Structure 1
Amino acid sequence: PRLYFENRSKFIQDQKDKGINPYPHKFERTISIPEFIEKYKDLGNGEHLEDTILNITGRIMRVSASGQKLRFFDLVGDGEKIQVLANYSFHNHEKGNFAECYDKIRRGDIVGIVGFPGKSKKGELSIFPKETILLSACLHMLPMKGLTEIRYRQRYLDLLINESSRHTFVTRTKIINFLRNFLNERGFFEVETPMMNLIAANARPFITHHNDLDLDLYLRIATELPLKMLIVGGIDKVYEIGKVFRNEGIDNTHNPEFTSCEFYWAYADYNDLIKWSEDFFSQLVYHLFGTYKISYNKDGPENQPIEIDFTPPYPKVSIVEEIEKVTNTILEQPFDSNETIEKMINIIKEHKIELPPTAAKLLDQLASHFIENKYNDKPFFIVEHPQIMSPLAKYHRTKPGLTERLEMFICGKEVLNAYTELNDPFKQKECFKLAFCTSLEYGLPPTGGLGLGIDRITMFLTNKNSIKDVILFPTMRPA
C-alpha cells in the first residue's frame, strides 16, 4: 500500500549512502527502442550480435523470472516494447554484483542499458545487457493493464499503461497537422489574434484583469472578428487554430476551454464552402484510415458500433423545410410574428421539449429534436438557416428570409459551421444602432467563413464518447 512508497524512498537514500547516484545526470544512448526494433527485427532465432555494443533506455514494465543467472524484463519506449535478457554470462562483474544489481529493479523504473542485440531461442527480440543503471526510480506501484477517474487527473499513468491512450492523442496531433497542411497547400495564411479582448459574448465570458492597465479583459469566445479585419486588411485567405473559451456547463460534448479552427476566404461562395467541407473530411478520414468508412460506438463500448461513411458528397437538409415536413406544419414568414412563434411553441409542448422562448431559440430547439439525428451513418449538412438565426450570414439569393449557411453534423453533433458573410453594412442589423461595423465601412469583399470544432472531430475519429477523452489535461473539480 503506502508502505511501498516509503520503502522505495528508503531505497533511494540507501543507494545514495552507498555512493550510488540513483538519478544520474547524463546517460548517452545510441539508439531508440523503435529504431532498435526496426533494425534488428529480422535476426534469426537465438541469433546474436555480440560485437554490436549499444546504449538503450526505457521504462521497465515487467519484472519476470529471477533465476540467479537469467533475468527477464519488458522495456518500453515511445509506445513500443522489447525484452531485456540479463544473462550472468555477459554481465560486467567489474561494475557490480549480478544478482544484487538486478534485484533492486522494480516495475516502472527507468533504466540505461549497455549491451548487444539478439533474439532468444524462443524468438524474442531482446537487448542483452552487460550493464544496467537506474536512471529514475518509480516510487509508487504502477497500476496494471484497471484504471478509473485517474486517467484525467494523472494522464501520464493513462499514457503509460493504456495502449489506446497514446494512439488517441497521436491521432489528435495528426488531425491538426493535416488540417494545417490542407489549408497551407490552398494558399491560406496562419495568424494569431488575441486570446484577451474587450467584449463579453452572447455565450458568457471568462473575465480577468490586467492590473498595470487597470483593465478588465475577456477571453475570446471565437476568432471571428479579428480574422475578418484581416480580410479587410488584404490578407485574403486567413486562418487560426487555437483555444476558445465559453464559460458554460460541462458535458460529454462541451468543455469550457476548447480548440477551434476558423478561416475566412475572400471571394468564396456557398458551394466553395461546401466543397471545402467535403474535400476536407473525406481526405482527412482516408489519410488516417485508408478508407472513408469508420466504426464508431455512439452508445458506449458495451453496445454495438455503427458505421459512419465519409464518402462524398454529403446530404444537405434545409432546416425550415425539414421541420415543416416532419411536424406537418407550415412555418410562415416572418418567423418573428407571434403566430409563427405561437405555432413553434405549440409544436414544442406537444412533443415534450423545453424551449427562454424566442424565434431563433425555438428554431434551434426544433432543429435539435427533429433534424440533427436525421443521419448517423454519414455526415450531413443542415443548410439555409433563417436570417433571424444567422445575423452575420449573407441572404439566400432565391429563398426569401433565408441565408447561405451550412452546418455539418456527425452523429447528431455539430462539428462545423460556415457561411457567406453579410458584407453590406446597411443590411447589417448591429450597424443599425452603431469596431466590426467600422471594418465593414472600409470595404469587406464577398467572403466565406468557416469554423471547425477540433475536439469533437477528434472524438469521432478516435472512437470517444466524451470530450475529456481527447483533451490531455481537462480542467476538473480538485475533489
Structure 2
Amino acid sequence: PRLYFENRSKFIQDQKDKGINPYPHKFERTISIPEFIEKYKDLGNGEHLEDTILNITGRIMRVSASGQKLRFFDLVGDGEKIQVLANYSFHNHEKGNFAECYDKIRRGDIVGIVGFPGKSKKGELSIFPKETILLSACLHMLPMKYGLKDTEIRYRQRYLDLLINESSRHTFVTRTKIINFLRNFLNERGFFEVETPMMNLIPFITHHNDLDLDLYLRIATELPLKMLIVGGIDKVYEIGKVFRNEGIDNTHNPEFTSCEFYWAYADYNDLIKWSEDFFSQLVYHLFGTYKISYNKDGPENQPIEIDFTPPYPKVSIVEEIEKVTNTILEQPFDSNETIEKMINIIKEHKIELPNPPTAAKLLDQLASHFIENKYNDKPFFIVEHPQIMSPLAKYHRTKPGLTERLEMFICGKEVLNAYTELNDPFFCTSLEYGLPPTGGLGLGIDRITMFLTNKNSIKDVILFPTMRP
C-alpha cells in the first residue's frame, strides 16, 4: 500500500536508468476512444482491420492475462471504454519483449498504443497493439467502486471520483448542460450578460491592504444590476458566484451559483410565462420528456415523479392560509391584533418555532407549514406575498398590503424568486434618476441541478465543495 508506492517509485527510477522515459514528451493520437467506438462498434465479431493503423491513448482500468501470448486490458478515456487485446503474434519484438513490456503495466497507467481495430470472438470491441508505451504512471493503488461511495474522498479527491464512478462524471456534465442551456435561453430572448463586483461594502469580510478598507463578498447581484437598467440596458443578467458565511452541511456551501436578470417593462404574467417556459424547456431538453424521478427521501427510499408540464399552479399565500386555517386576516395591516391571530395559529395548530415574533417571520412559518409542501407531484408558485415579507417589490395593483411577488417551488424547496421592482424612491441615488417598471428574477442553480441529477446533497453537484479537514 505505502509499499506499492515506493515500489512504483523505484520502478520509475529504474526505467530512467534502463534508458526509458516513463513520462515522454508527446505521443501523437489519431483518435479518441469515443471516436474509435462510434466507428468500429458496428464492426462484426472476430473482424479485424489489419490495414488500419491507429494511435490511441487512455487509462488502464483492468488488467488480466491469458498465457503470455495473450494479455487483456480495459482502456478508458472521456468516460468511454474499449478493450486492449495484446497478442504475442502482433507484438513488434524489435522494440522489446512481449511479456517484459506488458507485466510492467498497472491499473491506472496512462498508455499510448499503436495498433489496429477489431472485435474479438465474443463481440467485444478492441484495439490490437503492435506497441504500447507508458505515457504517465499511476504511483498509487487506484481503489474500486465500493472503495469509495460512500466515502469522504469523493469530495477531497474528485479526480478519483471522476475516473472510477461513471455516474458522477455524468452528473457534472448535466450541470454544465444546464447552465449552457440557461445562458442561451436568455441570449435568445435578447438578454445581456454582465459581470459585477464579487467584492463590496455592505457576510464575508476581507481587507484590502493598500486602501486599509474592509471589503464585502457579495450575497447577491441585484443592486449593480438594477443600476445597469437605469443605465438603460433593458434586459441584463449575471450567472456567477455568491457567498454565505454560515454552517457547512449537505445543503450548505460557502459559495453558491446564482443567476439574476432584470427585465424593463416586464410585469407578472411575463415572469411566470418565463419561469414556465424555462423549466418545461430545460427538462425536456435534458430528458426528452417533462417527467422525472427524484429521490425526495434519499436513495434508501423510493423515487417520486415530478411533472414539469406547463402551466403550473399559482397559490396566493394569504388567500390559501385564510382558507385552510379558517380564520381571517386580510386586514392589510399585519401587526398587533393580526400578530395575535397568527401567533394563536402557531400553537393552536400543531406547532412550530415562533422565532423572534415578527409578522413577516410568522407569515413565513405559516406558508412553510401549510403551503410549501402542498405539491410534490409538480412544481408550483406561491404568489402575491404581503409587502411586509417583501420590502423591495412594487405594490399590488388591486390588493392592499400585498405585492405581485412569485416564488417557484419543487419538493418544498425554493427554486425561483421574482417580482416587479418598487421604483418610487418615496444605489438609492440611482433610483432617483429614474428606474422604469421592471421585473427581477433569481434562480437557485445548484438546487435545480440537484433535482435534475437526482441528488440530495449539494456536495454531489459542486466539484470541489468546501470541506473541514
**Where on the TM-score scale, by shorter chain, does this alignment land: which range?**
over 0.9
* Alignment CA distance shift 1:335-1:149 (3 Å): farther
**Partner of 1:161 in structure 2?**
164
Q: Does 1:176 align with 2:179?
A: yes
Alignment check: 8 A CA contact 1:419 1:450 kept: yes
Shift of 1:347: 2.0
* Alignment CA distance shift 1:335-1:112 (3 Å): farther
Alignment partners' CA distance in 2, 1:335 and 1:317: 21
- 133-142 or 234-243: bigger deviation: 133-142
Shift of 1:332: 4.4
Shift of 1:17: 1.7
Alignment check: 8 A CA contact 2:110 2:134 kept: yes
Alignment partners' CA distance in 2, 1:223 and 1:84: 52
Alignment check: 8 A CA contact 1:335 1:341 kept: no
SS of residue paired to 2:293: strand
Alignment partners' CA distance in 1, 2:329 and 2:316: 13
- 233-242 or 15-24: bigger deviation: 15-24
Alignment partners' CA distance in 2, 1:440 and 1:228: 9
**Partner of 2:134 in structure 1?**
134
Alignment partners' CA distance in 2, 1:114 and 1:92: 10
Shift of 1:133: 0.8
SS of residue paired to 1:61: strand
Unaligned runs of 5+ in 1: 200-204, 426-435
Shift of 1:2: 2.0
Alignment partners' CA distance in 1, 2:347 and 2:6: 62
Q: Superposed, which structure 2 residues align to 1:324-343 within 5 Å? A: 324-343=322-341
Alignment check: 8 A CA contact 2:394 2:404 kept: yes
Alignment partners' CA distance in 1, 2:228 and 2:66: 67
SS of residue paired to 2:407: strand
Alignment check: 8 A CA contact 2:418 2:440 kept: yes
SS of residue paired to 1:261: strand
- 52-61 or 134-143: bigger deviation: 134-143
SS of residue paired to 1:89: coil
Alignment check: 8 A CA contact 2:318 2:330 kept: no
- The normalised TM-score by structure 2 is 0.97
Alignment check: 8 A CA contact 1:285 1:291 kept: yes
- 246-255 or 19-28: bigger deviation: 246-255
Deviations 1:105-158 (A, max 9, x none): 111111010111111121111011111111111111112124111111111111
* Alignment CA distance shift 1:207-1:351 (3 Å): farther
Shift of 1:354: 4.5
Alignment partners' CA distance in 2, 1:388 and 1:33: 59
The two structures, once aligned, show a CA RMSD in angstroms of 1.2
Shift of 1:66: 4.2
Alignment check: 8 A CA contact 1:334 1:340 kept: no
Deviations 1:361-414 (A, max 9, x none): 111121112211000000000000000111110111111111010000110000
SS of residue paired to 1:469: coil
Alignment partners' CA distance in 1, 2:247 and 2:234: 36
**Partner of 1:32 in structure 2?**
32
Shift of 1:185: 0.4
- 351-360 or 98-107: bigger deviation: 351-360
Shift of 1:418: 0.4
* Alignment CA distance shift 1:3-1:335 (3 Å): farther
Alignment check: 8 A CA contact 1:384 1:404 kept: yes
Alignment check: 8 A CA contact 1:92 1:131 kept: yes
- 58-67 or 444-453: bigger deviation: 58-67
Shift of 1:328: 2.1
Alignment partners' CA distance in 2, 1:4 and 1:66: 24
Shift of 1:335: 4.5
SS of residue paired to 1:131: strand
Alignment partners' CA distance in 2, 1:255 and 1:404: 30
Shift of 1:256: 2.4
Shift of 1:230: 0.4
SS of residue paired to 1:364: helix
Alignment check: 8 A CA contact 1:332 1:340 kept: no
Alignment check: 8 A CA contact 1:223 1:262 kept: yes
Shift of 1:80: 0.2
Shift of 1:301: 1.1
Alignment partners' CA distance in 2, 1:335 and 1:329: 16
SS of residue paired to 1:470: coil
Shift of 1:214: 1.1
**Structure 1: which 4+ aligned runs deviate by more than 4 Å?**
351-354
Shift of 1:319: 0.9
SS of residue paired to 2:89: helix
Alignment check: 8 A CA contact 2:90 2:129 kept: yes
* Alignment CA distance shift 1:13-1:66 (3 Å): farther
Q: Figure out how many residues of one structure are paired with residues of the other and give that number.
A: 463
- 178-187 or 329-338: bigger deviation: 329-338
Alignment partners' CA distance in 2, 1:352 and 1:141: 55
Shift of 1:8: 1.5
Alignment partners' CA distance in 2, 1:213 and 1:134: 53
- 169-178 or 2-11: bigger deviation: 2-11
Alignment check: 8 A CA contact 1:387 1:393 kept: yes
